[PDB]
Amino acid sequence: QKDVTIKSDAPDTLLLEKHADYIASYGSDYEYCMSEYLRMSGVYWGLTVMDLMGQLHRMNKEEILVFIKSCQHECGGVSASIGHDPHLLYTLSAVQILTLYDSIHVINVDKVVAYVQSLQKEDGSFAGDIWGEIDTRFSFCAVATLALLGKLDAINVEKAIEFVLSCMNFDGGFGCRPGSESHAGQIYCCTGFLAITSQLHQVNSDLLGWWLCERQLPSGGLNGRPEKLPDVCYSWWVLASLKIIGRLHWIDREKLRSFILACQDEETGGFADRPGDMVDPFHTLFGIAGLSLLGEEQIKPVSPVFCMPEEVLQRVNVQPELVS
Amino acid sequence: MHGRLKEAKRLEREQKLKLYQSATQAVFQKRQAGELDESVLELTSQILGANPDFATLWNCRREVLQHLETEKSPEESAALVKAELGFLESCLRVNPKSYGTWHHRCWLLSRLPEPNWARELELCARFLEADERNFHCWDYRRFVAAQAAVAPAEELAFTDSLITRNFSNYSSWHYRSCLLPQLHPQPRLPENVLLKELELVQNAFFTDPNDQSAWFYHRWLLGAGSGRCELSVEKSTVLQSELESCKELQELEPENKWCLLTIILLMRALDPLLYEKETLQYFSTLKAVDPMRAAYLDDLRSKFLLENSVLKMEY
Ligand SMILES: [Ca+2]
Ligand SMILES: [Zn+2]
Whether residue A246 is annotated as binding a ligand: the answer is: no
Q: Which residues of A touch B213 (CB under 8 A)?
A: 226-227
Gap between the Cα atoms of A235 and A226, Å rounded: 16
| B3 contacts on A by Cβ (under 8 Å) | 273, 277
What's the gap in Å between the CA of A317 and the closest CA on chain B? 33
In 3D space, the residue among A118, A59, A87, A68 whose CA is nearest the CA of residue B99 turns out to be A87
A225/B170 CB distance under 8 A: yes
Q: Which of A254, A276, A230, A267 is nearest to A19 (CA)?
A: A267
Question: Is A210 close to B6, i.e. CB distance below 8 A?
Answer: no
| Resolution of the entry in angstroms | 2.1
Mapped onto helix, strand or coil, the DSSP state of residue B150 is coil
Contact (CB, 8 A) for A240 and A304? yes
Check if the beta carbon of residue B242 is closer than 8 Å to that of residue B202: yes
Asked if B20's CB is within 8 angstroms of A34's CB, the reply is: yes
| DSSP bridge pairs for A168 | A174
Q: Is A280 helix (H, G, I), strand (E, B) or coil?
A: strand
Range of the domain at A184: 1-324
Burial class (CB in 10 A: 0-12, 13-18, 19+), B93: exposed
Please give the Cα distance from B144 to B109 (Å, whole number).
Answer: 9
CA–CA distance, B315 with B308 (Å, rounded to integer): 11
Contact residues, chain A, for B182 at CB < 8 Å: none
Amino acid at the residue B263: I
Q: What share of chain A is helix, strand, coil (3-state, %, to 5)?
A: 50, 5, 45
Experimental method reported for this structure: X-ray
Q: Top-level CATH class of B1-315?
A: mainly alpha
Number of domains forming the structure of chain A: 1
C-alpha dist (Å) from residue B225 to A244, B182, B243:
29, 16, 16
Measured CA to CA, the distance from residue B179 to residue B143 in angstroms comes to 14
